[PDB]
Amino acid sequence: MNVNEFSNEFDVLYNNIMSNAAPGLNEYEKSVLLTKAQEEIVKNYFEPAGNKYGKGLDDSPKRQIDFSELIKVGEGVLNTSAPTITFDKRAKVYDLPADLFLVINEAVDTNAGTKQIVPISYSDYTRLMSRPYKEPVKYQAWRIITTSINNISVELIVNSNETITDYKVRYIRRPAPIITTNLSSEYGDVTINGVSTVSECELNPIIHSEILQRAVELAKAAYQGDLQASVELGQRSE
Amino acid sequence: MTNKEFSDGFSTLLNSFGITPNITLDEYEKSTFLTNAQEQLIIDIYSGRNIIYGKSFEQTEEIRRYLSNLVETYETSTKVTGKLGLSKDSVFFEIPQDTWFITYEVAFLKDSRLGCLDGIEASVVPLPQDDLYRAKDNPFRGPSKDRVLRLDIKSDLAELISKYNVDKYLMRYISQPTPIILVDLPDGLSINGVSTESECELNPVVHRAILERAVQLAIISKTQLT
């Protein structure tokens, strides 16, 4: 469903049927609420605990098809452009894509074959570097986030005498905003995430109704305006 | 089996990264447990203490085919000069320093006194120290033209007590096996002083028994406190 249909059905669900009808929302307000609902729905559905079903990214066909249109595969760029201070002497720094929302799978192709990257925690880092070996298992590599500016920088730790040829990253693309109308104005150009032009929902139509319902709920919570509504409907921001 | 096959079979037998509870090892841990299993197995085989086999060093064809690749022969004519022995006619010879157990040990003699028998090969008899005093004068078990007494002493030495001069000393021992190292280990690490990859030098017949014992040692290591 296109942006016109979002706005029309938003009006229908918000104030065209309600008894003591409230003031209609401006298109900037509707676009804001739709974008917020979009991010909220994505974050609810990625985490099993964030939604009532207890199901995460790949725990049912619906959850697969939800993010099917948001999955992207790219490559990390070796960060030898400038010098830097790595926490680990034997770690190669790589830069992830700018439009990165969540990492779900990583892999590195070395001279010794492909190796799955395991994102090790800081407590797991401390535990693993206390052992005599201090290297990953056969078919894996280790990863820790390093000094990041304007985009995520990543430290890859592979076994000794191994060189990395490429670093593929299956991530979830950052959702584009939903903007109903050209927000250009003579009084000042307003933007949702830096874009004022019309922007369609770049996700599957399976969750367009979901985003609309969340937008309506947020609109009515803002209309109520008490601390209670904001606190209870902020629990789902996550 | 090769090092790659060793690691892959180790993972398969341990059910690494399966759905059921399991154990995952680093290649260093795999190397450590494979080496421990190797050396335990060959020592138990040599001593005949393995209940599965229950046979000694060369007691059957199976054990021959297992430990055939550790049997090393050695020759030496040099004698260590400054040492204190238990008899005047005591000569000392160095050991190759990689020996595990001496299995054949013979000594050639060069002396004028045993005329026309010169260059006689002589059986080195390992003799305990209890028997030494009462074996020095023994004409049936003591030193003679066809028999030499060897006593082990410090610094990897062999004190050969003979009535005649000893010219050459021949050995056939079981050697240190090369460790089973599946990866070039980082700096500092080593197994038996070896840092690079090291393939098992025994026959493939015993590689799978070594793998089974290494797997059992792994489960014991992870499941000795639970």
Asked if A27 reaches chain B (Cβ–Cβ under 8 Å), the answer is: no
Closest partner CB to B26 (pick from A135, A160, A161): A135
Contact flag B26-A133 (C-beta cutoff 8 Å): yes
Contact flag A134-B186 (C-beta cutoff 8 Å): yes
Give CA torsion, residues A65, A66, A69, A74, to 10 deg.
Answer: -100
A203 neighbors A210 (Cβ within 8 angstroms): no
Distance from CA of A155 to the nearest CA of B (A): 19
A107 neighbors A166 (Cβ within 8 angstroms): no
Residue A93's beta-bridge partner residues? A155
Closest partner CB to A137 (pick from B24, B184, B186): B24
A152 neighbors A175 (Cβ within 8 angstroms): no
Asked if A163 reaches chain B (Cβ–Cβ under 8 Å), the answer is: no
C-alpha distances in Å from residue A174, one per residue of A42, A59, A177, B118: 10, 21, 9, 94
Contact flag B11-A138 (C-beta cutoff 8 Å): yes
Instruction: Name the experimental technique.
Output: cryo-EM
Strands A113-119 and A140-145: parallel
Q: B179: Cβ–Cβ under 8 A, 6 or more apart, which residues? A: B31, B35, B38, B191, B192, B194, B198
| Token reading at A20 | 């003591």
Closest partner CB to A135 (pick from B7, B24, B186): B186
Q: Which residues of B touch A128 (CB under 8 A)?
A: none
| Token reading at A35 | 């974008």
Contact flag A160-B186 (C-beta cutoff 8 Å): yes
Closest partner CB to A133 (pick from B7, B11, B189): B189
A157 neighbors A141 (Cβ within 8 angstroms): yes
Distance, CA of B38 to CA of A38 (rounded, Å) = 60
Smallest CA–CA distance from A140 into chain B, residue? B26
Smallest CA–CA distance from B26 into chain A, residue? A137
Smallest CA–CA distance from A160 into chain B, residue? B186
Distance, CA of B135 to CA of B143 (rounded, Å) = 8
3-state secondary structure chain B: CCHHHHHHHHHHHHCCCCCCCCCCCCHHHHHHHHHHHHHHHHHHHHHCCCCCCCCCCCCCHHHHHHHHHHEEEEEECCCECCCCCCCCCEEEEECCCCEEEEEEEEEEECCCCCCCCCCEEEEEEECCCCCHHHHHCCCCCCCECCEEEEEEECCCEEEEECCCCEEEEEEEEEECCCCCECCCCCCCCCECCECCCECCCCCCCCHHHHHHHHHHHHHHHHCCCC
Distance, CA of A170 to CA of A102 (rounded, Å) = 9
Strands A92-95 and B90-94: unpaired
Nearest CA to B146 out of B131, B159, B134, B164 is that of B164
Which candidate in B26, B33, B182 is best for mutational testing of the A interface (most A CBs within 10 A)?
B26
Buried b / exposed e along B44-78 (16+ C-beta atoms within 10 A): ebbeeebeebebebeeeeebeebbeebeeebeeee
Closest partner CB to B27 (pick from A131, A132, A138): A138
List the 115-144 stretch of A: residues with Cβ below 8 A of B.
131-138
Distance, CA of A19 to CA of A1 (rounded, Å) = 27
Q: Using CB atoms within 10 A of its CB, is residue B97 exposed (0-12), middle (13-18) or buried (19+)? A: exposed
Distance, CA of A144 to CA of A154 (rounded, Å) = 6
Distance, CA of A203 to CA of A189 (rounded, Å) = 26
Smallest CA–CA distance from B8 into chain A, residue? A138
Distance from CA of A10 to the nearest CA of B (A): 46
Q: Which residues of A touch B29 (CB under 8 A)?
A: 133
Distance, CA of A84 to CA of B89 (rounded, Å) = 72
Q: Which residues of A touch B184 (CB under 8 A)?
A: 160-161
| Token reading at B17 | 């990264």
Distance, CA of A220 to CA of B224 (rounded, Å) = 61
Distance, CA of B32 to CA of B192 (rounded, Å) = 10
What residues in chain B have their Cβ under 8 A from chain A's Cβ atoms?
Answer: 7, 11, 24-29, 183-186, 189
Closest partner CB to B26 (pick from A137, A160, A161): A137
Give CA torsion, residues B78, B83, B88, B92, to 10 deg.
Answer: -30
Distance, CA of B97 to CA of B16 (rounded, Å) = 39
Give CA torsion, residues A31, A35, A40, A43, to 10 deg.
Answer: 170
Amino acid type, A94: Y
Q: What backbone torsions phi and psi does residue B128 show, to the nearest 5 degrees?
A: -70, 165
| Token reading at A11 | 């009006």
Strands B99-109 and B90-94: unpaired
Place of tokens 């001593």: B47
Distance, CA of A105 to CA of A117 (rounded, Å) = 8
C-alpha distances in Å from residue A150, one per residue of A75, A97, A99, A147, B28: 17, 10, 11, 10, 39
Contact flag B26-A160 (C-beta cutoff 8 Å): no
3-state secondary structure chain A: CCHHHHHHHHHHHHCCCCCCCCCCCCHHHHHHHHHHHHHHHHHHHHCHHHCCCCCCCCCCHHHHHHHHHHEEEEECEECCCCCCCCCCCCCEEEECCCCEEEEEEEEEEECCEEEEEEECCHHHHHHHCCCCCCCCCCCEEEEEECCCCCCCEEEEECCCCCCEEEEEEEEEECCCCCECCCCCCCCCCCCCCCCCCCECCCCCHHHHHHHHHHHHHHHHHHHHCCHHHHHHHHCCCC
Smallest CA–CA distance from B10 into chain A, residue? A138
Q: Using CB atoms within 10 A of its CB, is residue B221 exposed (0-12), middle (13-18) or buried (19+)? A: middle
| Token reading at A121 | 């925690």
Supply the Cα-derived Rg of chain A in whole angstroms. 22
